[PDB]
Amino acid sequence: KYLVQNRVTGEIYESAQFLYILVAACLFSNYPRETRLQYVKRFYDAVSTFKISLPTPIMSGVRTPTRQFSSCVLIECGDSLDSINATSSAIVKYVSQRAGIGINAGRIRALGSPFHTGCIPFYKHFQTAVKSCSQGGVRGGAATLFYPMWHLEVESLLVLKNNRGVEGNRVRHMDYGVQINKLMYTRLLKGEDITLFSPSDVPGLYDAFFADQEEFERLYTKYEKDDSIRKQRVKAVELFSLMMQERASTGRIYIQNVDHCNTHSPFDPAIAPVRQSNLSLEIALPTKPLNDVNDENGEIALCTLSAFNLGAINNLDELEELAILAVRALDALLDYQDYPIPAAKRGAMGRRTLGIGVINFAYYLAKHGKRYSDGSANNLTHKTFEAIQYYLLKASNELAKEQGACPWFNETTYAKGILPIDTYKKDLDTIANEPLHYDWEALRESIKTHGLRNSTLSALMPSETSSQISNATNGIEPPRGYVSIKASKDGILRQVVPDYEHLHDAYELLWEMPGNDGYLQLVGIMQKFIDQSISANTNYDPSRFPSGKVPMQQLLKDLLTAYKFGVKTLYYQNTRDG
Amino acid sequence: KYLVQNRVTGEIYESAQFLYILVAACLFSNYPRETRLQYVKRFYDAVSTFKISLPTPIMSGVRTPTRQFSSCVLIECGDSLDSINATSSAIVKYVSQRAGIGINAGRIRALGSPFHTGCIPFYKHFQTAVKSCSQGGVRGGAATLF
Amino acid sequence: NLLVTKRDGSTERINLDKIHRVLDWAAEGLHNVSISQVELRSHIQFYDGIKTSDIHETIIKAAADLISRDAPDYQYLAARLAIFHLRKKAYGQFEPPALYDHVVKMVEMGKYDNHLLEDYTEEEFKQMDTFIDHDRDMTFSYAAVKQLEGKYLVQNRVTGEIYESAQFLYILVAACLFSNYPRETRLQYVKRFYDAVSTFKISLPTPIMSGVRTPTRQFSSCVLIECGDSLDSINATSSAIVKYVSQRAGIGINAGRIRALGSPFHTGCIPFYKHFQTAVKSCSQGGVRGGAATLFYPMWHLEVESLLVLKNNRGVEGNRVRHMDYGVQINKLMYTRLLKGEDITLFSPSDVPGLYDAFFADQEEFERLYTKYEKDDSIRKQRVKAVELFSLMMQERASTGRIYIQNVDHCNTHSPFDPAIAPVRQSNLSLEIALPTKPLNDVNDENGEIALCTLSAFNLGAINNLDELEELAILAVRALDALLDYQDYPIPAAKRGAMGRRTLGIGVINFAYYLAKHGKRYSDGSANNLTHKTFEAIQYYLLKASNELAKEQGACPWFNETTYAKGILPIDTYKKDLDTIANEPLHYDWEALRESIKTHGLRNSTLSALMPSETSSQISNATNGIEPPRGYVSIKASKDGILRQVVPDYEHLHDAYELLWEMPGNDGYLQLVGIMQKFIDQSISANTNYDPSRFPSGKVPMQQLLKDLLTAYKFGVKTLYYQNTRDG
Amino acid sequence: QIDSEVDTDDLSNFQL
Amino acid sequence: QIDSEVDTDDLSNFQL
């Protein structure tokens, strides 16, 4: 899938080094002769020696006549038929180019309101929108759809992929992200009730949910007293139970902590709140709903991805040269690639957002003799992820000095002199004591003065196809086994985790973890520095439990843990099978 | 179905001959004063003695604030994502006002062509558009594809 | 910093050192246990603001999760951490309060009995407080402490509060059972019995363990009811059951006298069996878990074929009674018909006068009457092929594992009772109890008799040599005999049996472990003479202790009805084939004891019975009863996680054990049951076991089932309980 | 499941 | 399959 080939006749036309040099060439083509070629050499070296990992659309496309490189889009849908149709048309356009979709649809009013028919028929429509370019309605085309936990219709929505219903009240082939905040959890803890509203009957309530937790407080309690307002009262334990029950069985009901996404964010939630995520739950950017497919006043979020290979770098100071190379390469791509929908071009040119993450983290922990489950990796993660963010921020800062900050820079918390080290969930102090090693105060000032080329730089995505290229453990995930098996037309494809020979006992494979606590502490620690979010899983082995049944108590506990340590999103739940 | 009434309270506000007379008054409201009431009277007689039969939307709508009376719409889809999207939006707008749809989709290219993934995924998408404003995707909203 | 929410409701700094000290305290003397491992696995689960109590739960469970064959000592680490936790809960500190201060406080709370304060003076509690060694709590395994906390320690079942600790439980049990002894000896008995039970030499059953010292007097855990062939008796039986199951007793019902369907009560046994079943389940959670019974009937009952298929899940509702177990009663003649390939004649007990009586009491009288009624064809009868009937029984036994066998002739030829006056005509739930009964007219019939037995066991792994059993038997008989006078009797016929016969059932635990340390096995015959020697010691010394008691406090009212009274002893009556499989001579003076029994009699009509222990033997980490373990490690579920237990001394004896499925067959095990039965007053809960994979095409042949049945018969086995079949 | 292998000659030998 | 072990007292302690 990477080498320029004839897909009809099965002919291969190039080799991997031509692929790498030419990618370097197209991305730096617009640089001045003074520096053009030295950039080309250095980026080639970085990628040909696996220090920087490139995503699939860049890997197979850059150097070819195509300009389709956007692999993930985020669309907010307003509460009108015009917006619904606009959202739907955008999806169709993007999936025909293989992008993965993140859809926020929580604003759509509930069934029975003053649009009588409610959310589900529209969700169905978004699903057919997503599958509109798929092999036969199955494989290919993917989306996650987001809505608040307190939506009046939430109960119907929680069971949407539950294979156990009637056709009319099911939308099985999309994933869902339930949105939660401090208050929703407090109701669970206090054993109290949760009030369900249609977003259309509670003015200003949806806005606060994301942007302002105390404003949500007042409005929520207000609309709970006011009983001219349409409402349903549900026990907090039952709603959380139902969600987790559907999460447990499908592994495909996600969680987003919307307050964390805004209290600890590179964006001023007053001007540009984060109200959703993407397919895999690592992207976290501002959006605005559209009137029309071509609405200039709408905004669709886009992100360009890459990753550092932590197993190919000898020491953390290598990340300086690499961050310069990665930011500058991906920023040039923003100006290079097509935008089939005007609201998408708006987000990309206005905010210039990037998502550079990691691969080989399990392997990296292994060679430093650390583990996921015991806390032994805490200070190393803190040290490793501070290096990452400091140097990305630095590289984008030098770029802002050279080529000017991003048009909408003034909407970031960065612009106000604020930094991730100022806003992070304060409980991280109790689980790591690594001090800061880099001059953050000088960088603050340098950011104040000259701004950033890009509004975000970091996001931890799952890599799967990518990390095979450099034989690496996926993203930040522990391996399931020493040997990874795959099928193909050509036979059984096997892969051995890197340096198995010397490190077999150093690894901690997924199911060797007594529980999730250790892993979630590291996600929290990573999240201190990450602009966007992290694709983080929860995992459960039935046999570690009485009668092979995972208790609800542990599910809710691990949920609260992730909350306590400032985890923004929770992706897959994996359950082992005998 | 027809007499002006309350959705919430079940209270009925009119009788049949008021229905008939005011339908006539509305439709011929713009005729000049030398023929207007002559038309109103003759049309009224025609309908109330059952010589001319009027469809449900007119029967219930004309005399009230609404202006939605189109019960059947025909849309031809072109072989492009822009046309497919526009067809979809159109169907949504129209099924929202209770109209039945004829969709021509014979132009969308077959599976395997230089679209590539075929008509069926698009037909599915027309179906969800047709059903976007009904029940839990059944009661209300109907279509025939050609 | 990390904050902890204290027991009351306020916060404070986390004390990482206090936790480490408690862990180090717990690990003292233990091998192969990493305190560091437990620390990592529990520390990672803590959070800012954690309740102090949940820290304890987390460390305990952390230690419990590491229990294994390679590190069995985590059993003890986890245990001591729980004891430590339980101490704080109960007292607000590690050190228990002084005995008297505790007894006082508990009586005031209505949790301990007030008679304790009357029977004993403050100075006497001070002295009992010196007998106690609270550090004996350091000697429980994890599973043991889970049982104490689950169901033994006086606790508030509503609020989940624990009020005592295991040593208070033990001293006070000793106190209530000896309360009526004279000041001269009272306290020395109290000390010695405390020692015996606190150091696991004597094992106590659940109702005694959780009840004695409390305001309750409900201690009967097994009752035996005979039902006569009339509606009055049927109703009486039914009412008795309801009364007993409401107190958690297990029931043994004899219902073989009820006349067959179609006799001169037209409707037959099954509708009444159904009624007994609903009687048993009348106090159960929802008609399922709790309330248990075994129902007995003769093999030759006219209706037997319908009865053999009663739990066969494969019928219509009207001819099924699934939730009871059944015990089929057999004798010499029934088997001879099988061997000779002949027929078996089925009669309703109501058409064959004197036939049912002889079946139990007189084998030659049964001979004559049986053959007579077979010639006499005015008498209602069915003729069935002996192979088919035995096959059907064993087929239903094989698939449910819950059709039992009782050899009624063995129960009477080799018995402490004169079958002419007081025959044994049935057993209890688990098939170890074997006592006389009489049917009732009415729930309150004074002329009826319901059998009762009070249980305990010797731990064969805690005694160093067999001569320890003298002091222990004195302690066990005297304790359990005092209980007879202490406990309530909700049905007059039950009080009749208990006061008249004063029957006891003292058995064993840790037998597998005991065989292991003597380097012997179940399956090969290597344990035969050791079993003979071990079980002779048991019976001689129990008989001795009850004999001294008869001299001190007079024999049991109905003593004259025992074979003992006639100078007869178990060594005189046992199945004579045991001679061919053991040659251990007798070591104790049985002839002097005969005379001493002739003259002064026995306090109790029976003393010995081998019961399954299950909950009991966990307390002292012991193999169950006389059963070989299924594995080295026993797994159980609870609200608190996976509870694991390692067979005792795995470290030194792993190869010495013979686990259940390592046995090539049943022969070796059954020889030991027979050898044990030579001395046992009552019977033994003995299983048969089969592994399909040891057989062609994974099917257990009938030939082997009938063979093992006949073997058990040949060696004088009285009862056969479970059949266990292994699954892949 | 069990096999109904019942051999009457085999059995008949046994002494009770 | 999962067990609906929801203990409201246990939970209520946690500090968010």
Side-chain angles (χ1 to χ4, degrees):
Chain A
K1 53 170 80 160
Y2 291 5
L3 297 180
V4 167
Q5 62 190 266
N6 184 344
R7 205 45 63 99
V8 190
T9 67
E11 280 165 61
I12 284 90
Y13 300 126
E14 48 156 39
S15 52
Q17 298 320 305
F18 288 152
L19 184 159
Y20 287 133
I21 197 71
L22 301 183
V23 165
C26 302
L27 297 194
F28 290 98
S29 51
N30 280 171
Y31 275 62
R33 244 96 186 164
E34 291 88 290
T35 58
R36 181 138 139 283
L37 286 189
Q38 89 144 153
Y39 273 117
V40 172
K41 176 225 166 55
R42 291 202 276 120
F43 182 85
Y44 166 75
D45 285 349
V47 301
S48 60
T49 66
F50 320 123
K51 315 217 182 67
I52 297 170
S53 206
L54 293 179
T56 290
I58 293 169
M59 278 278 91
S60 53
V62 178
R63 98 209 88 116
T64 76
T66 181
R67 299 296 181 282
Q68 280 164 44
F69 305 113
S70 289
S71 81
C72 70
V73 328
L74 286 71
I75 321 158
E76 199 183 354
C77 174
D79 187 33
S80 69
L81 300 169
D82 289 343
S83 190
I84 290 173
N85 291 336
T87 307
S88 182
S89 297
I91 294 166
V92 165
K93 268 265 193 279
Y94 268 122
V95 305
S96 70
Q97 304 173 193
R98 296 136 77 102
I101 321 294
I103 326 158
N104 182 357
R107 276 139 83 102
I108 306 180
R109 55 167 74 80
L111 156 85
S113 276
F115 283 117
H116 270 206
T117 48
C119 292
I120 298 168
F122 298 118
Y123 281 30
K124 277 165 166 293
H125 190 58
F126 297 140
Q127 175 181 277
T128 48
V130 168
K131 300 298 187 170
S132 67
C133 301
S134 282
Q135 142 260 313
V138 258
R139 187 204 86 272
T144 302
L145 196 148
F146 303 78
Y147 59 82
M149 164 164 264
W150 54 257
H151 194 277
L152 171 55
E153 233 178 313
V154 75
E155 285 188 290
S156 267
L157 307 185
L158 253 18
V159 276
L160 275 182
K161 39 198 300 137
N162 191 274
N163 49 305
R164 317 202 82 282
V166 70
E167 216 54 49
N169 279 153
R170 290 292 179 273
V171 203
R172 299 86 39 238
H173 303 284
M174 283 201 296
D175 295 330
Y176 302 92
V178 189
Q179 299 170 320
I180 317 170
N181 68 344
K182 230 266 190 57
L183 176 75
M184 293 288 96
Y185 289 115
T186 303
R187 297 294 173 98
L188 175 70
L189 296 193
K190 273 182 129 103
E192 289 161 0
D193 266 21
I194 281 166
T195 323
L196 308 176
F197 299 126
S198 173
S200 64
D201 303 344
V202 285
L205 206 250
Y206 188 95
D207 293 300
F209 184 54
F210 307 93
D212 199 288
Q213 298 320 304
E214 40 163 12
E215 189 51 21
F216 185 88
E217 263 275 65
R218 185 183 70 71
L219 295 171
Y220 197 81
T221 31
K222 177 149 182 158
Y223 300 142
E224 288 181 298
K225 270 89 144 77
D226 178 357
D227 38 346
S228 79
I229 302 185
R230 184 149 130 89
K231 49 165 58 67
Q232 247 302 303
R233 214 143 273 271
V234 294
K235 199 83 44 40
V237 291
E238 311 266 36
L239 187 55
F240 274 98
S241 264
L242 173 58
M243 172 178 70
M244 297 308 280
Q245 212 168 304
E246 289 298 321
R247 182 179 167 81
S249 56
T250 66
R252 302 283 211 159
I253 304 303
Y254 308 136
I255 274 83
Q256 181 190 27
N257 297 312
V258 290
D259 45 7
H260 294 327
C261 293
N262 288 290
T263 54
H264 178 61
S265 170
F267 297 107
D268 190 329
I271 323 165
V274 175
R275 300 207 275 245
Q276 73 169 88
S277 189
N278 71 318
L279 178 60
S280 0
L281 289 261
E282 81 281 13
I283 305 311
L285 308 176
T287 54
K288 219 269 201 74
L290 287 74
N291 259 8
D292 180 80
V293 212
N294 288 305
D295 187 4
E296 308 285 355
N297 295 172
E299 197 199 343
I300 292 168
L302 291 186
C303 209
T304 296
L305 316 180
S306 274
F308 300 121
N309 185 346
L310 293 172
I313 72 150
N314 284 327
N315 78 107
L316 297 182
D317 289 335
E318 282 183 52
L319 288 168
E320 193 174 47
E321 311 83 64
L322 296 176
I324 283 167
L325 262 12
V327 174
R328 287 176 169 265
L330 295 197
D331 187 75
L333 186 62
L334 297 176
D335 298 330
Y336 189 75
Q337 70 185 349
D338 280 348
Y339 300 88
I341 286 141
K345 200 200 179 80
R346 277 252 289 166
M349 297 302 89
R351 330 202 103 103
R352 295 191 82 92
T353 48
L354 300 184
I356 296 164
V358 297
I359 64 173
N360 249 351
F361 186 63
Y363 172 51
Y364 174 82
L365 285 198
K367 52 192 278 183
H368 286 70
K370 315 284 169 145
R371 286 165 208 285
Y372 282 84
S373 59
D374 55 5
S376 74
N378 293 25
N379 296 325
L380 179 59
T381 299
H382 195 293
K383 184 223 258 272
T384 300
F385 279 79
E386 183 203 7
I388 285 154
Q389 191 59 12
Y390 169 91
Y391 278 120
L392 283 176
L393 284 183
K394 189 157 172 286
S396 190
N397 176 250
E398 313 290 305
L399 199 49
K401 293 218 305 277
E402 184 189 295
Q403 295 172 23
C406 69
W408 297 352
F409 183 72
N410 68 301
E411 298 170 315
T412 67
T413 54
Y414 286 126
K416 302 319 227 336
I418 294 171
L419 288 162
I421 73 173
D422 312 311
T423 39
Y424 68 85
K425 186 83 158 72
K426 271 130 74 59
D427 292 68
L428 292 174
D429 292 350
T430 70
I431 63 156
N433 56 48
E434 191 70 12
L436 295 148
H437 296 230
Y438 291 98
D439 197 356
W440 283 82
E441 295 309 302
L443 178 92
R444 191 186 308 274
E445 228 49 46
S446 198
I447 283 173
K448 256 193 260 275
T449 326
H450 316 129
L452 302 165
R453 185 63 175 171
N454 326 84
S455 299
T456 61
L457 285 124
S458 56
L460 303 179
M461 71 293 294
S463 60
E464 167 61 352
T465 309
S466 283
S467 33
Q468 284 169 54
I469 285 300
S470 76
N471 186 208
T473 66
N474 311 136
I476 59 147
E477 294 311 290
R480 265 158 251 90
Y482 293 126
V483 174
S484 186
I485 293 105
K486 274 99 201 310
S488 79
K489 202 162 185 293
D490 304 325
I492 317 257
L493 305 191
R494 290 187 194 78
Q495 209 177 28
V496 187
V497 302
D499 203 17
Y500 174 83
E501 184 163 21
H502 303 265
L503 314 171
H504 59 280
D505 290 304
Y507 282 101
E508 172 169 47
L509 304 183
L510 184 73
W511 303 123
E512 308 186 300
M513 304 198 305
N516 291 292
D517 309 75
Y519 171 90
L520 290 182
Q521 285 198 8
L522 302 179
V523 170
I525 288 153
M526 293 164 183
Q527 189 65 83
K528 179 156 153 168
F529 303 100
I530 296 301
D531 287 314
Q532 305 191 64
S533 187
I534 303 159
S535 301
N537 304 134
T538 58
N539 305 274
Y540 298 98
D541 188 342
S543 74
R544 283 194 191 265
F545 298 93
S547 332
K549 49 188 73 174
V550 190
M552 184 60 53
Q553 189 76 25
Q554 194 53 57
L555 297 174
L556 297 167
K557 190 214 189 282
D558 291 339
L559 181 63
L560 305 166
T561 295
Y563 190 79
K564 181 161 189 68
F565 294 115
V567 165
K568 287 170 178 183
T569 50
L570 278 175
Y571 195 30
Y572 294 149
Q573 189 198 294
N574 303 292
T575 313
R576 196 192 192 173
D577 41 27
Chain B
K1 303 246 186 63
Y2 302 160
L3 297 163
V4 172
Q5 65 180 253
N6 203 314
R7 282 295 94 192
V8 187
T9 74
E11 206 185 303
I12 290 145
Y13 299 125
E14 66 168 2
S15 57
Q17 304 309 311
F18 287 161
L19 183 158
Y20 289 141
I21 201 75
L22 298 162
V23 163
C26 285
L27 300 187
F28 293 93
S29 86
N30 278 189
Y31 271 56
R33 281 204 278 273
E34 27 281 295
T35 58
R36 183 142 128 286
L37 293 189
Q38 178 165 18
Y39 273 114
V40 166
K41 180 198 160 66
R42 291 203 289 113
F43 183 83
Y44 162 83
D45 289 338
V47 290
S48 50
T49 64
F50 311 125
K51 276 141 159 168
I52 287 179
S53 173
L54 305 172
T56 291
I58 291 176
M59 280 285 97
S60 66
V62 177
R63 95 210 79 130
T64 74
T66 192
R67 299 292 188 262
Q68 296 175 8
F69 299 112
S70 300
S71 82
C72 84
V73 337
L74 287 60
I75 333 197
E76 183 176 359
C77 184
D79 189 25
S80 73
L81 300 174
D82 283 358
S83 200
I84 289 162
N85 281 353
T87 301
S88 183
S89 306
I91 288 154
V92 167
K93 281 284 201 200
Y94 268 116
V95 292
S96 110
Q97 297 167 199
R98 287 198 89 231
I101 322 293
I103 311 159
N104 182 357
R107 290 156 162 267
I108 301 169
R109 58 167 64 88
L111 163 72
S113 297
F115 291 180
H116 212 296
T117 57
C119 295
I120 302 187
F122 296 122
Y123 286 26
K124 260 159 182 292
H125 190 56
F126 298 147
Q127 191 182 258
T128 40
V130 173
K131 253 91 184 40
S132 57
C133 293
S134 51
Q135 167 70 215
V138 275
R139 180 199 119 286
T144 291
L145 194 152
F146 300 80
Chain C
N1 286 60
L2 261 155
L3 300 147
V4 174
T5 316
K6 280 282 172 184
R7 32 287 262 86
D8 49 77
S10 49
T11 81
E12 190 195 325
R13 191 100 314 117
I14 207 279
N15 212 316
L16 284 171
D17 300 2
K18 193 216 268 247
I19 282 154
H20 184 84
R21 272 162 179 84
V22 176
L23 266 180
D24 188 37
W25 162 81
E28 226 50 23
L30 299 183
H31 299 138
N32 247 102
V33 295
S34 173
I35 285 167
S36 166
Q37 272 308 133
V38 172
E39 275 177 345
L40 291 173
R41 278 155 147 270
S42 62
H43 288 199
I44 202 68
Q45 298 171 67
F46 300 155
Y47 50 90
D48 206 50
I50 185 152
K51 186 77 181 293
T52 157
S53 175
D54 294 320
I55 294 174
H56 296 163
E57 316 280 49
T58 301
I59 52 167
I60 294 161
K61 194 193 172 304
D65 282 357
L66 294 159
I67 298 169
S68 78
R69 348 204 329 189
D70 316 279
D73 278 20
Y74 281 107
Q75 280 183 119
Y76 292 109
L77 188 82
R80 290 159 174 186
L81 293 163
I83 287 298
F84 184 81
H85 181 61
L86 293 177
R87 293 281 185 85
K88 301 228 149 169
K89 266 181 86 59
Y91 316 122
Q93 42 149 9
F94 179 72
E95 254 256 281
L99 178 57
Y100 182 79
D101 297 310
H102 171 77
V103 174
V104 161
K105 193 198 165 205
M106 291 284 282
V107 167
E108 234 150 61
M109 286 185 62
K111 299 320 291 257
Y112 283 164
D113 202 281
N114 81 283
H115 87 66
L116 276 165
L117 284 175
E118 276 138 51
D119 294 359
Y120 293 89
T121 73
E122 194 200 322
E123 231 56 40
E124 288 182 315
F125 284 107
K126 278 214 218 278
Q127 207 191 148
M128 273 186 291
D129 204 23
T130 66
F131 297 162
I132 301 180
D133 185 352
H134 287 301
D135 287 344
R136 310 245 255 252
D137 291 353
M138 255 57 99
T139 69
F140 290 115
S141 61
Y142 187 54
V145 180
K146 254 48 247 310
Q147 298 297 340
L148 294 166
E149 176 189 30
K151 53 170 80 160
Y152 291 5
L153 297 180
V154 167
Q155 62 190 266
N156 184 344
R157 205 45 63 99
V158 190
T159 67
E161 280 165 61
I162 284 90
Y163 300 126
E164 48 156 39
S165 52
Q167 298 320 305
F168 288 152
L169 184 159
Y170 287 133
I171 197 71
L172 301 183
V173 165
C176 302
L177 297 194
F178 290 98
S179 51
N180 280 171
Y181 275 62
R183 244 96 186 164
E184 291 88 290
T185 58
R186 181 138 139 283
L187 286 189
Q188 89 144 153
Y189 273 117
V190 172
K191 176 225 166 55
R192 291 202 276 120
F193 182 85
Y194 166 75
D195 285 349
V197 301
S198 60
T199 66
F200 320 123
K201 315 217 182 67
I202 297 170
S203 206
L204 293 179
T206 290
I208 293 169
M209 278 278 91
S210 53
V212 178
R213 98 209 88 116
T214 76
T216 181
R217 299 296 181 282
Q218 280 164 44
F219 305 113
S220 289
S221 81
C222 70
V223 328
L224 286 71
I225 321 158
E226 199 183 354
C227 174
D229 187 33
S230 69
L231 300 169
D232 289 343
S233 190
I234 290 173
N235 291 336
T237 307
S238 182
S239 297
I241 294 166
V242 165
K243 268 265 193 279
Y244 268 122
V245 305
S246 70
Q247 304 173 193
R248 296 136 77 102
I251 321 294
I253 326 158
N254 182 357
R257 276 139 83 102
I258 306 180
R259 55 167 74 80
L261 156 85
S263 276
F265 283 117
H266 270 206
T267 48
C269 292
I270 298 168
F272 298 118
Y273 281 30
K274 277 165 166 293
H275 190 58
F276 297 140
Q277 175 181 277
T278 48
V280 168
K281 300 298 187 170
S282 67
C283 301
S284 282
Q285 142 260 313
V288 258
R289 187 204 86 272
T294 302
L295 196 148
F296 303 78
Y297 59 82
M299 164 164 264
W300 54 257
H301 194 277
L302 171 55
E303 233 178 313
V304 75
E305 285 188 290
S306 267
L307 307 185
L308 253 18
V309 276
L310 275 182
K311 39 198 300 137
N312 191 274
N313 49 305
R314 317 202 82 282
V316 70
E317 216 54 49
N319 279 153
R320 290 292 179 273
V321 203
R322 299 86 39 238
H323 303 284
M324 283 201 296
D325 295 330
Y326 302 92
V328 189
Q329 299 170 320
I330 317 170
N331 68 344
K332 230 266 190 57
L333 176 75
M334 293 288 96
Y335 289 115
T336 303
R337 297 294 173 98
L338 175 70
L339 296 193
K340 273 182 129 103
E342 289 161 0
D343 266 21
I344 281 166
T345 323
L346 308 176
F347 299 126
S348 173
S350 64
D351 303 344
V352 285
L355 206 250
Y356 188 95
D357 293 300
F359 184 54
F360 307 93
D362 199 288
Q363 298 320 304
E364 40 163 12
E365 189 51 21
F366 185 88
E367 263 275 65
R368 185 183 70 71
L369 295 171
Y370 197 81
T371 31
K372 177 149 182 158
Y373 300 142
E374 288 181 298
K375 271 89 144 77
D376 178 357
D377 38 346
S378 79
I379 302 185
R380 184 149 130 89
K381 49 165 58 67
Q382 247 302 303
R383 214 143 273 271
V384 294
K385 199 83 44 40
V387 291
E388 311 266 36
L389 187 55
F390 274 98
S391 264
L392 173 58
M393 172 178 70
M394 297 308 280
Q395 212 168 304
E396 289 298 321
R397 182 179 167 81
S399 56
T400 66
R402 302 283 211 159
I403 304 303
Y404 308 136
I405 274 83
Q406 181 190 27
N407 297 312
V408 290
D409 45 7
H410 294 327
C411 293
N412 288 290
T413 54
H414 178 61
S415 170
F417 297 107
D418 190 329
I421 323 165
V424 175
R425 300 207 275 245
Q426 73 169 88
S427 189
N428 71 318
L429 178 60
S430 0
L431 289 261
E432 81 281 13
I433 305 311
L435 308 176
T437 54
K438 219 269 201 74
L440 287 74
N441 259 8
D442 180 80
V443 212
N444 288 305
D445 187 4
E446 308 285 355
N447 295 172
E449 197 199 343
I450 292 168
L452 291 186
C453 209
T454 296
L455 316 180
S456 274
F458 300 121
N459 185 346
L460 293 172
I463 72 150
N464 284 327
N465 78 107
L466 297 182
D467 289 335
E468 282 183 52
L469 288 168
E470 193 174 47
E471 311 83 64
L472 296 176
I474 283 167
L475 262 12
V477 174
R478 287 176 169 265
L480 295 197
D481 187 75
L483 186 62
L484 297 176
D485 298 330
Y486 189 75
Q487 70 185 349
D488 280 348
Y489 300 88
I491 286 141
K495 200 200 179 80
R496 277 252 289 166
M499 297 302 89
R501 330 202 103 103
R502 295 191 82 92
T503 48
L504 300 184
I506 296 164
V508 297
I509 64 173
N510 249 351
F511 186 63
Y513 172 51
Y514 174 82
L515 285 198
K517 52 192 278 183
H518 286 70
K520 315 284 169 145
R521 286 165 208 285
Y522 282 84
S523 59
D524 55 5
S526 74
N528 293 25
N529 296 325
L530 179 59
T531 299
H532 195 293
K533 184 223 258 272
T534 300
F535 279 79
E536 183 203 7
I538 285 154
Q539 191 59 12
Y540 169 91
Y541 278 120
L542 283 176
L543 284 183
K544 189 157 172 286
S546 190
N547 176 250
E548 313 290 305
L549 199 49
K551 293 218 305 277
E552 184 189 295
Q553 295 172 23
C556 69
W558 297 352
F559 183 72
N560 68 301
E561 298 170 315
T562 67
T563 54
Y564 286 126
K566 302 319 227 336
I568 294 171
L569 288 162
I571 73 173
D572 312 311
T573 39
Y574 68 85
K575 186 83 158 72
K576 271 130 74 59
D577 292 68
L578 292 174
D579 292 350
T580 70
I581 63 156
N583 56 48
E584 191 70 12
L586 295 148
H587 296 230
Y588 291 98
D589 197 356
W590 283 82
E591 295 309 302
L593 178 92
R594 191 186 308 274
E595 228 49 46
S596 198
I597 283 173
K598 256 193 260 275
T599 326
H600 316 129
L602 302 165
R603 185 63 175 171
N604 326 84
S605 299
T606 61
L607 285 124
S608 56
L610 303 179
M611 71 293 294
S613 60
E614 167 61 352
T615 309
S616 283
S617 33
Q618 284 169 54
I619 285 300
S620 76
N621 186 208
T623 66
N624 311 136
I626 59 147
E627 294 311 290
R630 265 158 251 90
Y632 293 126
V633 174
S634 186
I635 293 105
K636 274 99 201 310
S638 79
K639 202 162 185 293
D640 304 325
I642 317 257
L643 305 191
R644 290 187 194 78
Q645 209 177 28
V646 187
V647 302
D649 203 17
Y650 174 83
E651 184 163 21
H652 303 265
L653 314 171
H654 59 280
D655 290 304
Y657 282 101
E658 172 169 47
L659 304 183
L660 184 73
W661 303 123
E662 308 186 300
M663 304 198 305
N666 291 293
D667 309 75
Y669 171 90
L670 290 182
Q671 285 198 8
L672 302 179
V673 170
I675 288 153
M676 293 164 183
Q677 189 65 83
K678 179 156 153 168
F679 303 100
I680 296 301
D681 287 314
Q682 305 191 64
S683 187
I684 303 159
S685 301
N687 304 134
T688 58
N689 305 274
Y690 298 98
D691 188 342
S693 74
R694 283 194 191 265
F695 298 93
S697 332
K699 49 188 73 174
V700 190
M702 184 60 53
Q703 189 76 25
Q704 194 53 57
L705 297 174
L706 297 167
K707 190 214 189 282
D708 291 339
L709 181 63
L710 305 166
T711 295
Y713 190 79
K714 181 161 189 68
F715 294 115
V717 165
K718 287 170 178 183
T719 50
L720 278 175
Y721 195 30
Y722 294 149
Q723 189 198 294
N724 303 292
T725 313
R726 196 192 192 173
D727 41 27
Chain D
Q1 71 283 148
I2 64 282
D3 171 53
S4 302
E5 189 79 295
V6 199
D7 189 16
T8 30
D9 292 320
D10 203 345
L11 305 154
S12 64
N13 308 318
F14 202 96
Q15 288 183 12
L16 304 148
Chain E
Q1 71 283 148
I2 64 282
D3 171 53
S4 302
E5 189 79 295
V6 199
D7 189 16
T8 30
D9 292 320
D10 203 345
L11 305 154
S12 64
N13 308 318
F14 202 96
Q15 288 183 12
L16 304 148

